[PDB]
Amino acid sequence: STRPLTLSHGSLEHVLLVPTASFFIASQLQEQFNKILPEPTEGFAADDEPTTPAELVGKFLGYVSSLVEPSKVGQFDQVLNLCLTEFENCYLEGNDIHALAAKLLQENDTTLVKTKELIKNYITARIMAKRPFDKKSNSALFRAVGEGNAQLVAIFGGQGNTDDYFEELRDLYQTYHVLVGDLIKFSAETLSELIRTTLDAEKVFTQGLNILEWLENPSNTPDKDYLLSIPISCPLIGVIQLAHYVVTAKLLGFTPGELRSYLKGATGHSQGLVTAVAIAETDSWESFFVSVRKAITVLFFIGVRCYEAYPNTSLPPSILEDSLENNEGVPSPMLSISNLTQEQVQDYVNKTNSHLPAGKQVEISLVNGAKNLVVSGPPQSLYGLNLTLRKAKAPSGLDQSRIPFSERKLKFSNRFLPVASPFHSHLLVPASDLINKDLVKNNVSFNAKDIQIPVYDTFDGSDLRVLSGSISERIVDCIIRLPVKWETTTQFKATHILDFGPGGASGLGVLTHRNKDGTGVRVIVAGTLDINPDDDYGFKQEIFDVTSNGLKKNPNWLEEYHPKLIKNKSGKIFVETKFSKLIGRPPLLVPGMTPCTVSPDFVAATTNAGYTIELAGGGYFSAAGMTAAIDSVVSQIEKGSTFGINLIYVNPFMLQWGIPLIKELRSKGYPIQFLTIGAGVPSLEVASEYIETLGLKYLGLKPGSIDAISQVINIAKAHPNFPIALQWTGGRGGGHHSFEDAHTPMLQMYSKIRRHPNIMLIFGSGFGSADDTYPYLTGEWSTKFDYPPMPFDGFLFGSRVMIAKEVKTSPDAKKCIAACTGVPDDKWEQ
Amino acid sequence: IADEPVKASLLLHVLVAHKLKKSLDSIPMSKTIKDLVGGKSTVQNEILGDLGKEFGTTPEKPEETPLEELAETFQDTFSGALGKQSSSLLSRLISSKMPGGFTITVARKYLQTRWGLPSGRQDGVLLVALSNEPAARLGSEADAKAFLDSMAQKYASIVGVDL
Amino acid sequence: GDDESKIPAVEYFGGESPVDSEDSAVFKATSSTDEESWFKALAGSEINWRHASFLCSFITQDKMFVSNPIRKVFKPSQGMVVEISNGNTSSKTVVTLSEPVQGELKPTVILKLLKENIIQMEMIENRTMDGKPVSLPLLYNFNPDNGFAPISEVMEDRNQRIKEMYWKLWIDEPFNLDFDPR
Ligand SMILES: Cc1cc2nc3c(=O)[nH]c(=O)nc-3n(C[C@H](O)[C@H](O)[C@H](O)COP(=O)(O)O)c2cc1C
Ligand SMILES: *P(=O)(O)OCC(C)(C)[C@@H](O)C(=O)NCCC(=O)NCCS
């Protein structure tokens, strides 16, 4: 016997069956909620204004929970538990709140701030209704880890990822204050104790370190200069990591030790390495606040002592001005350099170190990627290095498309990181001795017996449990002195990586994603709710989601595009690739060559041999002349044999007689398997005409540059079912060539190509044997450039078949061809 | 006054200027997105998200091309449509700054009536309004009519159409 | 490991677009029958002569490439009833389409292997002069060594075999195409 009560904002509404025993308690709240709720607008696009029924019921749960006192069970408690159970049944169809919040972002006209209100309100209600997360969630990910389909590694980032790291901690306490409220309250009083205990510590912490006060009242928060300083930033970046690890442990209804037992391993970039050894000790909610006491104590005593070893001194304003106008940021002791390989950077830091004395020298302190370094040293010295660098650097605008590749100016980024101390450098070595003596004063040691999971060292990549010496000494040494070799530490095998660390999208996770793309590893950013449009790396929701969306996998190129061998009934062996599968012949094509493949005798000798070849359209001037050529090809080839046609795109007269000729030959069932457009990539509408009207099996396209590749990809998205043959050729190819390298463009675009299963990706230029092609078929060609393997689907041989018996090329031209010694790929731009 | 669809160069300039909390003049069009945002990669990738939602397909490394060479590439496959992003940015602008009794329609009819601007130019003026958000409750209706007047005179000064 | 006997075999290698156990079955077409699913069921799983017959979009007449007539014939419409016998043994498999003919259900088409490399699609007219059904055997070479287009009309005597059918349906005389047109 329940009386319906409608709560509404403008058009959208929600009817709840409030029991008549507590209707007049609910009906007064309905009015008081309708008061605080603003005036409805079209689209509901205003902030503090719900766009969906779900986040209106949410606002009501948040408002009621505010009035409910958790200790004394008053009147509103009974209607909260009913309004919460209505919100669960109607809107949470089994999923977690984070899965719901995600679904609203991609369908409705909600915002990130609005969905963080929804989540806060739901979670606040759930704790004020005496309904803790005691039940183990059926999250697809952790279900899969139990089964053994998924291996999980937890990574923790450090400094340098964001300017305002504290806004991430504010956003945690703003949303999950009913979960982590006890962690922050413990960490604050731990720190406030450590400041009073430690000698001469209050002189560094002038404005204290009570972070509870700073999170309650944002006005009492110190300035951004105090927060960024490493005595504050170190411990509080610890706290933010542990806070994300708590929230993830509670929302899944695990104990810390339960959530840790699911991790195959943990590791940490820089000072994150501390938090990674802390969670590897954790057992249950009782002994968790002992692991945290260790992590907060270590990071604190790093910050306090690394600050005293190398204090950051005010800089001359000319340098600061020069660094801003040149787009290098505010000088710091650590300088990120993107799109330069480590030997290039190590060359530049040797030139810079030649002039400087011992104490003022810069070293490479973090090798995050292949092409993503970080140089530590004094800010004067690093400025010095930055002056040297910006001479080599190419301006932002200039088009080097018409310049040979090796003559081009290197286009790279160099920016000062937002960090106050030079971590992983020879400058902080005096500190090392002090930290070790202060960790034994507070009895903070880590034992290999307590560490349940393998925690990976940053320097060498070895597990820290197998070490002989004290773990705490190695951690401090790895943070302050030894460099980080992030590609060497992350050489673990794992299908999923959780980035707890600060930053989120700009955090350690997405950087590890870039290094590992195409090795079949999926990064989940476990500290940020958002949506990825490309959906290559997940956000927080993917952890908690219970459907199929919770367990996603990223492509493993070596395994997905592995070359295979297959054998027809006759017992003829074929290299099986994406491309050979379609055409049913080896993945080797002789491309359209003017004039080598103009000859109908060569096109037929090649097609009869077993191998696909194009008839060159560039040796014909009329439909009639090409029709007679085509009919000479057909008369000579075997029944069922096909061939293709190369048309030049920059010759519009050829296309005008050529496209209609192919269309009406294909209508009459001429064996024209495919069309290759050379010299350019068509426009979307022209390619849509060629795909739809011509009645071809596939379309070959020869992109010259990156922009051309992107234009092929766009044609492939337009017709996702139609097979495109992207024929990639460098400048080193014979005939009309480009200025481009063979390798560099593929390394960049290979990932974006492989997101389109219709694109059959064919490498050409500078090939004449199995030996020099094999590495491309396999994918090991890209392991010399410090990338994952990148297998190709087929090859083309232009120049190599110019001295065949069946080529019309005159005997003396064949002796001039054979006489050419040629060069290797390093010397072709001469 | 003739109807002209909004230029990708204008729309892109407004999206970048609005996102960075800066005036439409403080952002030079001969500058890369990674240059203007500098440090904050968080700002960079959520700008590239906004350019992905508005125009759809993007050129490679769009944060390493100046906003002119980016806008001219966007302008090819773009045609006057406000799409998803700018639509929902303008919906926020008026519901938070324009007073009650001031919807997009009333502002659209007022720009049509007083100034004589069709839908192609109305969009243009609404975008120039978004870039120089007054960040203030415009309770007084006439105050909000003086706002749209100042922005129609800004739009006129940029595009170069006399009023 | 340098062993040719570990290499997976198939009948014919080719035709597979880059985007992508029952012995005695009985499929029934409807108005809403998903055409591609229909053909995938008729084809089966083993790569053989019937896989080619039902999923190749093209066949070869001499050197030309025409639409697959076996797919056109078997295209699913209300009433159709495809019975497969010996689904597992390819050398004995017989696909037997039946349609409604004078109210009752009769065998219209009988796709099967005749020799090793000949697919015979016997098309059957039931409405004949003397009530006895008339067969038109259309013959296709099945060449697995050409995986792209393994099927091809046997164009020798195709016109005489078509004529011989039409003769039984039109002319009550002995079949003989040797008389002078003049
Ligand atoms: C003699 C010759 C003629 C060519 N003619 C054409 C042509 O008409 N159209 C085209 O797109 N490519 C043409 N190419 C380029 C080839 O299609 C292919 O890109 C190139 O030969 C590969 O490099 P490689 O020949 O060093 O193996 C020609 C190449 C050569 C050597
Ligand atoms: P943006 O897209 O350029 O983001 C890159 C980055 C912020 C993730 C990256 O530059 C970074 O974080 N590098 C800093 C290295 C580090 O994490 N710590 C340095 C202090 S030990």
Q: Tokens for A295, please give them.
A: 């992590």
Cβ-count burial A284-314 (b if 16+ within 10 Å, e if not): eeeebeebbbbbbbbbbbbbbbbbbbbebee
Cα C167 to Cα C182: distance, rounded to the nearest angstrom: 20
Helices (H), A158-229: 166-175, 177-197, 211-216, 224-228
Ligand 1 proximity of A678 Cβ (cutoff 6 Å): yes
CA of A703 to the centre of ligand 1 (A): 13
CB A365 within 8 A of CB A385: no
Residue with tokens 């920016």: A415
Q: Which long-range contacts (CB under 8 A, 24 or more apart) does A403-409 make?
A: A403/A739, A404/A731, A404/A739, A404/A829, A405/A731, A405/A739, A405/A740, A405/A741, A405/A744, A405/A829, A406/A829, A407/A829
Q: Which residues of A touch B77 (CB under 8 A)?
A: 684
Q: Which atom of ligand 2 is nearest to the CA of A484?
A: 21
Per the CB < 8 Å rule, is B96 touching A47? yes
Q: Which of A373, A418, A159 is nearest to A270 (CA)?
A: A159
Three-state secondary structure call for residue A214: helix
Residue with tokens 């000798």: A605
Considering every ligand atom shown, identify the ligand nearest to the alpha carbon of residue A589 and give its number.
1
Q: Are β-strands A334-338 and A363-367 bridged in parallel, bridged antiparallel, or unpaired?
A: unpaired
CB A690 within 8 A of CB A675: yes
Q: Which of A466, A805, A398 is nearest to A609 (CA)?
A: A805
Rg (CA), chain A: 32
Query: Mind spelling out the 3-state secondary structure of B51-118?
Result: HHHHCCCCCCCHHHCEHHHHHHHHHHCCCCCCCCHHHHHHHHHHHHCCCCCCCHHHHHHHHHHHHCCC
Residue A212, burial from CB neighbour count under 10 angstroms (0-12, 13-18, 19+):
middle
Of A503, A533, A752, the CB nearest to B49: A533
The set of residues, in sequence order, having a beta carbon less than 8 Å from that of A445 and lying 6+ positions away, is: A439, A470, A471, A472
Q: Which residues of C touch A634 (CB under 8 A)?
A: 63
Q: Is A574 on the interface with C (CB under 8 A)?
A: yes
Chain B touches chain C, with at least 3 Cβ pairs below 8 Å, answer: no
CB A546 within 8 A of CB A93: no
User: What single-letter amino acid sits at A74?
Assistant: G
Torsion on CA atoms A502, A508, A509, A514, rounded to nearest 10: 150
Q: Does domain C24-155 have CATH number 3.40.1350.10?
A: no
Q: Tokens for C159, please give them.
A: 């016109």
Per the CB < 8 Å rule, is A503 touching B42? yes
DSSP state, A466?
A: T
Cα A198 to Cα A5: distance, rounded to the nearest angstrom: 59
User: What single-letter amino acid sits at A431?
Assistant: A
Which experimental method was this entry solved with? cryo-EM
**Other CB atoms within 10 A of residue A402 CB:** 7
The set of residues, in sequence order, having a beta carbon less than 8 Å from that of A32 and lying 6+ positions away, is: A63
CA of A816 to the centre of ligand 1 (A): 18
DSSP state, A427?
A: G
Per the CB < 8 Å rule, is A397 touching B91? no
End-to-end CA gap in chain A: 91
Looking at A562-714, which runs of residues are DSSP E strands? 564-567, 573-576, 588-590, 612-616, 643-648, 672-678, 698-701
CA of A508 to the centre of ligand 2 (A): 7
Q: Tokens for A582, please give them.
A: 């379609």
Cα C23 to Cα C46: distance, rounded to the nearest angstrom: 12
Helices (H), A68-139: 76-91, 97-107, 112-128
Q: Tokens for A16, please give them.
A: 């709840």
Cα A593 to Cα A143: distance, rounded to the nearest angstrom: 56
CB A307 within 8 A of CB A296: no
CA of A596 to the centre of ligand 1 (A): 9
Q: In chain A, positions 198-257, which contact chain B (CB-CB < 8 Å)?
A: none
Q: Tokens for A662, please give them.
A: 């192919």
Q: Which atom of ligand 2 is nearest to the CA of B41?
A: 1
Q: Tokens for A283, please give them.
A: 């057992």
CA of C157 to the centre of ligand 1 (A): 45
- Active-site residue A270, yes or no? yes
Q: Which atom of ligand 1 is nearest to the CA of A616?
A: 8
Q: Which long-range contacts (CB under 8 A, 24 or more apart) does A18-21 make?
A: A18/A79, A18/A82, A19/A82
Helices and strands (DSSP H and E) totals, chain B: 8, 0
User: What single-letter amino acid sits at A84?
Assistant: L
Per the CB < 8 Å rule, is C14 touching A723? no
Mutate to test the pocket of ligand 2, among A275, A312, A506, A512 (most ligand atoms within 8 A of CB): A506
**To which H or E segment does residue B124 belong?**
helix B119-131
Cα A743 to Cα A114: distance, rounded to the nearest angstrom: 45
Cα A824 to Cα A747: distance, rounded to the nearest angstrom: 20
Q: Tokens for A48, please give them.
A: 């503090």
Residue of the CA atom closest to atom 10 of ligand 1: A678
Q: Is C14 on the interface with A (CB under 8 A)?
A: yes
Mutate to test the pocket of ligand 2, among A155, A161, A481 (most ligand atoms within 8 A of CB): A161
Q: Which atom of ligand 1 is nearest to the CA of A591?
A: 17
Q: Tokens for A210, please give them.
A: 């009570």
User: What single-letter amino acid sits at A134?
Assistant: D
Q: CA–CA distance from A324 to each of A320, A666, A785, B37 (Å)? A: 6, 62, 33, 12
Cα A521 to Cα A499: distance, rounded to the nearest angstrom: 13
Q: Which residues of A touch B41 (CB under 8 A)?
A: 505-506
CB A385 within 8 A of CB A349: yes
Q: Is C156 on the interface with A (CB under 8 A)?
A: no
Q: Is B23 on the interface with A (CB under 8 A)?
A: no
Q: In chain C, after which residues is the C-to-N distance over 2.5 Å, breaking the chain?
A: 20
Q: Which residues of A touch C8 (CB under 8 A)?
A: 564-567
For residue B161, which phi and psi values (nearest 5 degrees)? -120, 120
**To which H or E segment does residue A140 belong?**
helix A140-147
CB A648 within 8 A of CB A617: yes
Q: Which chains touch A (3 or more CB pairs under 8 A)?
A: B, C
Considering every ligand atom shown, identify the ligand nearest to the alpha carbon of residue A616 and give its number.
1
Interface probe for A, chosen from B67, B92, B137 (most Cβ of A below 10 Å), is: B92
CA of A661 to the centre of ligand 1 (A): 23
Residue with tokens 């719901």: A100
**Other CB atoms within 10 A of residue A428 CB:** 26
Q: Which residues of A touch C145 (CB under 8 A)?
A: 568-570, 572
Considering every ligand atom shown, identify the ligand nearest to the alpha carbon of residue B47 and give its number.
2
Q: Which long-range contacts (CB under 8 A, 24 or more apart) does A375-378 make?
A: A375/A334, A375/A335, A375/A337, A375/A345, A375/A349, A376/A333, A376/A334, A376/A335, A376/A422, A376/A423, A376/A424, A376/A425, A376/A427, A377/A333, A377/A335, A377/A422, A377/A425, A377/A427, A378/A333, A378/A422, A378/A427
Dihedral sign, Cα of residue A630, residue A636, residue A640, residue A643: negative
Annotated catalytic residue: which of A139, A229, A233, A270?
A270
Sheet containing strand A484-485, strands side by side: A413-416, A334-338, A372-376, A363-367, A484-485
DSSP A733-762: SSSS--S--SSHHHHHHHHHHHT-TTEEEE
User: What single-letter amino acid sits at A385?
Assistant: L
Resolution in A: 2.9
Cα A684 to Cα A680: distance, rounded to the nearest angstrom: 13
Q: Is B137 on the interface with A (CB under 8 A)?
A: no
Ligand 1 proximity of A591 Cβ (cutoff 6 Å): yes
User: Would you call the peptide bond into A586 cis, given omega within 30 degrees of 0 as the criterion?
Assistant: no
DSSP state, A142?
A: H
Residue A792, burial from CB neighbour count under 10 angstroms (0-12, 13-18, 19+):
buried
Q: Is C147 on the interface with A (CB under 8 A)?
A: yes
Q: Which long-range contacts (CB under 8 A, 24 or more apart) does A84-91 make?
A: A84/A125, A84/A126, A84/A129, A84/A131, A86/A16, A86/A17, A86/A57, A87/A54, A87/A57, A87/A58, A87/A61, A87/A122, A87/A125, A90/A14, A90/A57, A91/A53, A91/A54, A91/A57
